[PDB]
Amino acid sequence: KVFGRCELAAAMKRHGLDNYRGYSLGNWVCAAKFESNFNTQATNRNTDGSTDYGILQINSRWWCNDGRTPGSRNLCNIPCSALLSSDITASVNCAKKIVSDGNGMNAWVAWRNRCKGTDVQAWIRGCRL
Ligand SMILES: [Cl-]
Ligand SMILES: [Cl-]
Ligand code: NA
Predict the structure, then answer these.
(1) Ligand 1 center to residue 111 CA distance, Å?
(2) Which residues surround ligand 2, an ion (CB under 5 A)?
(3) Is 35 in the active site?
(4) CATH code of residue 26
């Protein structure tokens, strides 16, 4: 599923991401835009043989099991394919664990490089929340 900007903002707000660990909704929408272009089916292979999955590009070395990242952990306790669903519940629940692990949203390279320090509220402007 390819979300619209406001559709995703509303879905994320319902799942508890607005101000989760102090990150306003605009941060999460900005990260999803540049991580996956709002596409739940996005996958990208990393150099080290791990793969990033879904709308927030969650990495198989630490967070989900894809059966092909040797010596990886599965801290979110899910198969990585669950992160590609049109239902973002699995992605959001895993993201809450990642952002709580000490490094905040710096875990997402695109957030660090393209959202951090910008006017992220622009990403929810005009939406009905
Ligand atoms: Cl915001
Ligand atoms: Cl933080
Ligand atoms: Na894994």
Answers:
(1) 13
(2) 104
(3) yes
(4) 1.10.530.10
